[PDB]
Amino acid sequence: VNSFSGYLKLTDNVYIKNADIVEEAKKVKPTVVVNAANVYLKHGGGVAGALNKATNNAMQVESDDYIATNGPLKVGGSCVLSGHNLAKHCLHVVGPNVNKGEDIQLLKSAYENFNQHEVLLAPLLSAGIFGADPIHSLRVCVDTVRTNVYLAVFDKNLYDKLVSSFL
Numbered sequence: 001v002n003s004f005s006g007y008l009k010l011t012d013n014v015y016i017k018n019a020d021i022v023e024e025a026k027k028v029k030p031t032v033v034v035n036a037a038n039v040y041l042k043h044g045g046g047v048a049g050a051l052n053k054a055t056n057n058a059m060q061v062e063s064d065d066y067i068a069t070n071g072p073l074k075v076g077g078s079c080v081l082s083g084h085n086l087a088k089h090c091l092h093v094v095g096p097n098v099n100k101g102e103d104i105q106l107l108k109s110a111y112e113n114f115n116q117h118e119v120l121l122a123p124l125l126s127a128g129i130f131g132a133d134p135i136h137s138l139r140v141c142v143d144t145v146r147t148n149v150y151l152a153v154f155d156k157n158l159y160d161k162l163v164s165s166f167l
């Protein structure tokens with residue numbers, strides 16, 4: 001038993017809520033929050049910009065040091081860094097961004113990173129400004145992640161469609 005509340009159950013291990021991921025992380029302070037990162041860990045917009053802003057740019061400073069030491073992530077890849085004031089840890093995961101010509105098939109590889117953590121709060125990968133269909137995205141999540149994932153979907157219209165249009 002944990003501190004998540006108000007989630008709709010999708011499968012044995014997947015849950016969903018219409019929530020801003022920043023407000024949810026501040027309220028729950030989970031062990032792991034997932035960031036929808038890019039390979040450079042440049043947290044400009046979407047989930048990444050919003051999480052970074054809530055850490056007063058400390059996430060960006062820690063990320064720049066990580067890149068200066070290790071180089072960029074892979075599309076489909078991840079790294080674990082601090083969660084700052086929002087979580088114990090932040091799992092930065094790079095879903096494919098279709099507006100940059102990135103391969104949609106790498107979305108499954110991105111979600112595989114979640115399996116290294118028993119419980120996560122996370123956004124839908126490659127949704128929002130990353131330009132994938134949040135619904136194909138939810139199907140890959142459900143068919144790939146085996147650990148306990150609490151999804152936050154910010155857009156009410158999108159949430160209603162995903163909960164409805166789910167097979």
Ligand SMILES: Cc1ccc(-c2nc(Cn3cnc4c(N)nc(N)nc43)cs2)o1
Pocket residue numbers: 019020021022046047050123124127128129130152153154155158
């Ligand atoms: C077609 C359509 C309508 C809305 C959207 C998008 N949603 C996202 C993901 N996202 C961005 N910011 C946040 C945030 N603060 N909280 C959560 N849970 N998700 C976030 C990217 S585009 O796409």
